[PDB]
Design a protein around this motif. Structure first.
Motif, PDB file in Angstrom:
ATOM      1  N   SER A 124      18.272  29.100 -78.839  1.00 22.84           N
ATOM      2  CA  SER A 124      18.980  29.266 -77.597  1.00 22.84           C
ATOM      3  C   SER A 124      19.268  27.875 -77.130  1.00 22.84           C
ATOM      4  CB  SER A 124      18.169  29.983 -76.499  1.00 22.84           C
ATOM      5  OG  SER A 124      17.027  29.214 -76.153  1.00 22.84           O
ATOM      6  N   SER A 125      19.970  27.696 -75.986  1.00 24.40           N
ATOM      7  CA  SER A 125      20.273  26.352 -75.567  1.00 24.40           C
ATOM      8  C   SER A 125      18.983  25.617 -75.402  1.00 24.40           C
ATOM      9  CB  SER A 125      21.047  26.270 -74.238  1.00 24.40           C
ATOM     10  OG  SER A 125      20.256  26.738 -73.156  1.00 24.40           O
ATOM     11  N   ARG A 126      18.720  24.670 -76.327  1.00 24.67           N
ATOM     12  CA  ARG A 126      17.521  23.887 -76.326  1.00 24.67           C
ATOM     13  C   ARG A 126      17.527  22.836 -75.267  1.00 24.67           C
ATOM     14  NH1 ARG A 126      20.949  25.294 -79.918  1.00 24.67           N
ATOM     15  NH2 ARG A 126      21.269  23.160 -80.889  1.00 24.67           N
ATOM     16  N   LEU A 127      18.689  22.192 -75.087  1.00 24.56           N
ATOM     17  CA  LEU A 127      18.755  21.009 -74.293  1.00 24.56           C
ATOM     18  C   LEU A 127      18.253  21.275 -72.923  1.00 24.56           C
ATOM     19  CD1 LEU A 127      19.583  18.057 -73.951  1.00 24.56           C
ATOM     20  CD2 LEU A 127      21.844  18.900 -73.095  1.00 24.56           C
ATOM     21  N   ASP A 128      18.647  22.400 -72.314  1.00 22.78           N
ATOM     22  CA  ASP A 128      18.269  22.579 -70.947  1.00 22.78           C
ATOM     23  C   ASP A 128      16.785  22.647 -70.814  1.00 22.78           C
ATOM     24  OD1 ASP A 128      18.046  25.029 -72.135  1.00 22.78           O
ATOM     25  OD2 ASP A 128      18.266  26.109 -70.201  1.00 22.78           O
ATOM     26  N   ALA A 129      16.084  23.265 -71.785  1.00 22.05           N
ATOM     27  CA  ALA A 129      14.654  23.408 -71.712  1.00 22.05           C
ATOM     28  C   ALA A 129      13.976  22.070 -71.726  1.00 22.05           C
ATOM     29  CB  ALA A 129      14.089  24.246 -72.871  1.00 22.05           C
ATOM     30  N   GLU A 130      14.453  21.111 -72.532  1.00 24.78           N
ATOM     31  CA  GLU A 130      13.762  19.855 -72.528  1.00 24.78           C
ATOM     32  C   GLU A 130      13.871  19.267 -71.173  1.00 24.78           C
ATOM     33  OE1 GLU A 130      16.285  18.323 -75.902  1.00 24.78           O
ATOM     34  OE2 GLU A 130      16.028  16.477 -74.681  1.00 24.78           O
ATOM     35  N   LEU A 131      15.066  19.346 -70.568  1.00 21.29           N
ATOM     36  CA  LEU A 131      15.150  18.848 -69.233  1.00 21.29           C
ATOM     37  C   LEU A 131      14.460  19.919 -68.470  1.00 21.29           C
ATOM     38  CD1 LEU A 131      17.089  16.945 -70.350  1.00 21.29           C
ATOM     39  CD2 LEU A 131      18.483  19.148 -70.280  1.00 21.29           C
ATOM     40  N   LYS A 132      14.103  19.770 -67.204  1.00 22.58           N
ATOM     41  CA  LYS A 132      13.464  20.830 -66.456  1.00 22.58           C
ATOM     42  C   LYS A 132      12.028  20.935 -66.806  1.00 22.58           C
ATOM     43  CE  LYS A 132      14.946  23.283 -63.610  1.00 22.58           C
ATOM     44  NZ  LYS A 132      16.070  24.241 -63.516  1.00 22.58           N
ATOM     45  N   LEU A 133      11.682  20.933 -68.097  1.00 21.10           N
ATOM     46  CA  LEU A 133      10.294  20.783 -68.334  1.00 21.10           C
ATOM     47  C   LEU A 133      10.077  19.352 -67.992  1.00 21.10           C
ATOM     48  CD1 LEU A 133       8.884  23.337 -68.692  1.00 21.10           C
ATOM     49  CD2 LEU A 133      11.193  23.415 -69.695  1.00 21.10           C
ATOM     50  N   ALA A 134      11.167  18.573 -68.107  1.00 23.25           N
ATOM     51  CA  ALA A 134      11.153  17.211 -67.670  1.00 23.25           C
ATOM     52  C   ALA A 134      10.246  16.433 -68.536  1.00 23.25           C
ATOM     53  CB  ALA A 134      10.634  17.074 -66.233  1.00 23.25           C
ATOM     54  N   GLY A 135       9.788  17.058 -69.621  1.00 22.08           N
ATOM     55  CA  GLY A 135       8.988  16.291 -70.510  1.00 22.08           C
ATOM     56  C   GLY A 135       9.911  16.009 -71.632  1.00 22.08           C
ATOM     57  N   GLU A 136       9.715  14.872 -72.316  1.00 26.20           N
ATOM     58  CA  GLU A 136      10.615  14.592 -73.385  1.00 26.20           C
ATOM     59  C   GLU A 136      10.363  15.608 -74.428  1.00 26.20           C
ATOM     60  OE1 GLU A 136       8.760  12.310 -72.106  1.00 26.20           O
ATOM     61  OE2 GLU A 136      10.448  11.504 -70.907  1.00 26.20           O
TER      62      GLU A 136
END
Lengths: 118, 149, 127, 76, 178
Positions: free
Chosen positions: E3-15
């Motif tokens: 699924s859209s991965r990118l958004d998850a990395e952001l928001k978790l705000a962890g790299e």
RNA sequence: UAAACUCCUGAACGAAACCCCCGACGAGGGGACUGACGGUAAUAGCGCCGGCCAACUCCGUGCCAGCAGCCGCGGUAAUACGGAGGGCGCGAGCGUUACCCGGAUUCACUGGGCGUAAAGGGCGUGUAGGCGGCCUGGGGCGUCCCAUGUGAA
RNA sequence: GAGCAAACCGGAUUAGAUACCCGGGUAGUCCACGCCCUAAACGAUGCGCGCUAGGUCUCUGGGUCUCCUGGGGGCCGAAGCUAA
């Protein structure tokens, strides 16, 4: 008994079979009033479920037109919601009718702009 | 080498004639991590004064929890020497030692003490009356005092 | 009730008042055995045989400290007459304080019992 | 296996009823519970064992219905 | 997932290197700094990310955590497996750690695609648990990202020889190693 | 190089069948074959933002239509209904219904209570039963230890 | 079976008075024998034992009797307990 046995926990919805959904036939498309201060005509329907063989009352979501539920339309009961009950509004209603699914006789409210269609 | 951690600060409101007036209470733990810890609760009109007041108070009244301490004789690396069960009032607290990586497994009242206590790893259990105040806390404190080793 | 419980209670009660001495209770072989550990662990200054009304009793020296609640803040009976409590060497229990168990080996502290690798009714816990 | 008990009854023919008593740790509770059972044991001579004797019973093939034991010997 | 991965990395705000890539939270306040969360927030948020990192299902993830939880020592790192236990142990992860793949997903495809070997036997199971003393070579037919890999250093727990395009899982890496 | 902007490394392994030798049938070493497709940037997120609980504004609606786990929200200014914008958390699935265990120590042992909140029996006598002071000796039933058997997959 | 007094019979008060107030009055209240078995049957606090400052008043026994000691009844209060 050795000790008195206390009443245990009871499941919130006995859709029987612990099933996700159960289908039943509408007996009557009544309208009940709310409790507490809120007032209005909540649309409800008595249903004869196949599974439990139990007769239950279920909420019919959506403004609906008139609503598309009649005397003997087939319906599916979600127990939508954790309990599927509308406690604050109406006591005695354990389940919600799924018309979002638009399964069976329950038609979906058409052209509902809002997201609750989901 | 006194680490200073603050358990928490509360607003503590009171009512007087036609008027509420609050003060702040701060609980502060102070410890060497070598076997010396002190707890101090000081109150003041302002949070900062309170914390500093507590820190100073904690520094006084230090107690020799037997956990690990500065390299000398060893306590138990972030853990307790033995299991103790203590009943205070209807409250009973049970402490059992655990290996590292276990974490501090306890309800909040017990936990909050054990963490400032410096204990990193323990398994606990609260039984009986669980009034945190009434005696779960007191019960924990007594349990800690009881430990030997 | 229980002789052992009575003794622990007497000491608990007396300490609260801060009595220096306390007839812990009438003496018994078992009770004295318990007190000996209490001494070694450092909970009590010591105990002594005393004669009260021609009856043997054990005086228990209380031992307190400046800081706050008694040196023996806790002391709670575990095994009790209604329900006896026996524990395997496996679950001796651990805490910062000690537990006194009675084993065929004798009455030992939790640590001692572990060494002996023995189990037994768990008389009480102190710390 | 081999069991020990007492001959409660001589009445039957070629058989004796031995009451074995047993104590044991119950798996669940671990409480030490005691129960006793009566076993019919085969006595061929019918003179071999009289009432009151303590005998050792041994597991055997079924002699009769409800009888799987033979008198090993007299303990007394 | 997928699924859209990118958004998850952001928001978790962890790299999260769902790809190897950038941290800033997508919406409403990408710029604003958010800091140490509460224990509660931490617990839930921790779950989704620890899992999301590996790109693994809850079902697999759960078993791993349960094991690491029972074992004594901090659950977190033991669970973590820098090489230590479990999580980085997966063959799919190791390939990523080895530099074979730019991202964890890419490594997953490589392993599935069969462009991976372990002990010379080709394994296309991403869930495969790599033990110490195993060699994770790149399939003969394939060979690519190794270049560029040349300068990059590798965890002390692992090692790789760029020439053979081989590498070994030396030992269970500690969180500190992480 | 992050951005803006431009274009899209390369998805679209699949193969193991028809092992021997050394080495522990392992790791490792030496002595199985076989791909047409074959190089294109190329499916999507879901829940939530009244308090518990992290996340707020406008609009529509008007005790309706609806929400709802609990407390509750809607009768013309609704952060609680529907949409939108914004926000918080972390969709090859996500959510519902049914059913079981949990939370429920709510058939409180761990781990609760009974002056006034629900809860001391109207009082006594006493059966069964539960419980039992100090010292010594025998037994070793409970209790503790060791070994062993069993505790299938 | 004297007095009292549900019900009841009257008087008054009241908007009404099936009540309160006033005049009568039966069961009953008393005794015996038998039955019923309830209660705010209350300390709203089950019984026994041990342990934990005192002060004050009181009933009953002993003592070396301006107080000590034992049993009982009250008040105030250490430690502690309690949501208060």
């Amino acid at each position: 008994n050795y000790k008195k046995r206390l009443l245990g926990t009871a499941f919130k919805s006995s859709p029987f079979g612990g099933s996700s959904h159960a289908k039943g036939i509408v007996l009557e498309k009544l309208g009940i009033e709310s409790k507490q201060p809120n007032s209005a005509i909540r649309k409800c329907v008595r249903v004869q479920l196949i599974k439990n063989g139990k007769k239950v009352t279920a909420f019919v979501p959506n403004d609906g037109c008139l609503n598309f539920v009649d005397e003997n339309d087939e319906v599916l009961l979600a127990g939508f919601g954790r309990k599927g009950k509308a406690k604050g509004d109406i006591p005695g209603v354990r389940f919600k009718v799924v018309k979002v699914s638009g399964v069976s006789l329950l038609a979906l409210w058409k052209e509902k702009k809002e997201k609750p269609r989901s | 080498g006194l680490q200073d951690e603050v358990m928490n600060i509360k607003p503590v409101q009171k009512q007087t004639r036609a008027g509420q007036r609050t003060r702040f209470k701060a609980v502060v733990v102070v410890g060497d991590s070598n076997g010396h810890v002190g707890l101090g609760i000081k109150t003041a009109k302002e949070v900062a004064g309170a914390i500093r007041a507590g820190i100073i108070i904690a520094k006084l009244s230090v107690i020799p929890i037997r956990r690990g301490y500065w390299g000398t004789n060893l306590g138990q690396p972030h853990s307790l020497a033995t299991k103790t069960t203590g009943k205070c009032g209807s409250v009973t607290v049970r402490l059992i030692p655990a290996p590292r990586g276990s974490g501090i497994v306890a309800s909040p009242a017990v936990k909050k003490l054990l963490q400032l206590a410096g204990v990193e790893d323990v398994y606990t259990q609260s039984n009986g009356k669980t009034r945190t105040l009434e005696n779960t806390l007191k019960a924990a404190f007594v349990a800690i005092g009881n430990t030997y080793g | 009730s229980s002789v052992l419980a009575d003794a622990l209670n007497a000491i608990n009660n007396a300490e609260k008042t801060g009595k220096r001495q306390v007839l812990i209770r009438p003496s018994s072989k078992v009770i004295i055995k318990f007190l000996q550990v209490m001494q070694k662990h450092g909970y009590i200054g010591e105990f002594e045989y005393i004669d009260d009304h021609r009856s043997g009793k054990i005086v228990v020296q209380l031992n307190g400290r400046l800081n706050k609640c008694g040196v023996i803040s806790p002391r709670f009976n575990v095994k009790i007459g209604d329900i006896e409590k026996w524990t395997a060497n496996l679950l001796p229990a651990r805490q910062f304080g000690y537990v006194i168990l009675t084993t065929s080996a004798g009455i030992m502290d939790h640590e001692e019992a572990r060494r002996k690798h023995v189990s037994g009714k768990i008389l009480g816990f102190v710390y | 296996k081999i069991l020990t008990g007492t001959v409660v009854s001589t009445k039957m023919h070629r058989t004796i009823v031995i009451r074995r008593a047993y104590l044991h740790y119950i798996p669940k509770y671990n409480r030490y519970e005691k129960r006793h059972k009566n076993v019919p044991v085969h006595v061929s001579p019918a003179f071999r064992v009289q009432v009151g004797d303590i005998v050792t019973v041994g597991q055997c093939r079924p002699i009769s219905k409800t009888v799987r034991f033979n008198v090993v010997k007299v303990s007394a | 997932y997928e699924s859209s991965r990118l958004d998850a990395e952001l928001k978790l705000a962890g790299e999260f290197g769902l790809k190897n890539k950038k941290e800033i939270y997508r919406i409403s306040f990408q710029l604003s700094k958010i800091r140490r969360a509460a224990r509660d927030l931490l617990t839930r948020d921790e779950k989704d990310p620890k899992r999301l990192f590996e790109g693994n299902a809850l079902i697999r993830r759960l078993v791993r955590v349960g094991v690491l939880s029972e074992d004594k020592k901090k659950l977190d790192y033991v669970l973590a497996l820098k090489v230590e236990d479990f999580l980085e142990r997966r063959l799919q992860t190791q390939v990523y750690k080895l530099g074979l793949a730019k991202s964890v997903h890419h490594a997953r495809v490589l392993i599935t695609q069969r462009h991976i070997a372990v002990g010379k036997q080709i394994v296309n199971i991403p869930s495969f648990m790599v033990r110490l003393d195993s060699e994770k070579h790149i399939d003969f037919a394939p060979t690519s990202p190794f270049g560029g890999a040349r300068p990059g250093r590798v965890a002390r727990r692992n090692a790789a020889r760029k020439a053979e395009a081989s590498g070994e899982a030396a030992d269970e890496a500690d969180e500190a190693d992480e």
